[PDB]
Structures are given as structure tokens and as C-alpha cells.
Amino acid sequence: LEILNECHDELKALPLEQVEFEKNTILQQRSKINSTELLDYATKLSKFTKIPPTFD
């Protein structure tokens, strides 16, 4: 009974509903925003966020 109790505890430790709301939020957030603006903004921030090794 003890060992199956820790098996139950460790199984419960690994996740239920919270993960599926989080996956949902990911899906509508991805669907709402188009990839063109994201790629343009990433290219425009590539110069600022990434510190070049030759910048003294």
C-alpha cells in the first residue's frame, strides 16, 4: 500500500485541466497573429537584441 501510494503521488505530480487551457491559449494566440509581421519584427530586432562580437 505504501509503495503504490508513492506511485500515485508521483503520477499525480505529472499533470490535467491546466495544461489543456495553456495549450488552448497557445492555439488561439498562434492563430490570431500572422507570421509575416512576426518575421518582420524578428528581422528588425535581430540587429538590436543580438550583440555582435565586433561591437567594442
Binding site: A13, P15, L16, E17, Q18, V19, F21, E22
Partner: peptide
């Protein structure tokens, strides 16, 4: 919101 509540140990 419930993610933090469900993800913390007792």
C-alpha cells in the same frame, strides 16, 4: 490562473 495552484507541491 489555476496552473500555478495545480502545479505547486503541497
Amino acid at each position: 490562473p489555476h496552473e500555478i495552484y495545480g502545479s505547486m507541491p503541497l
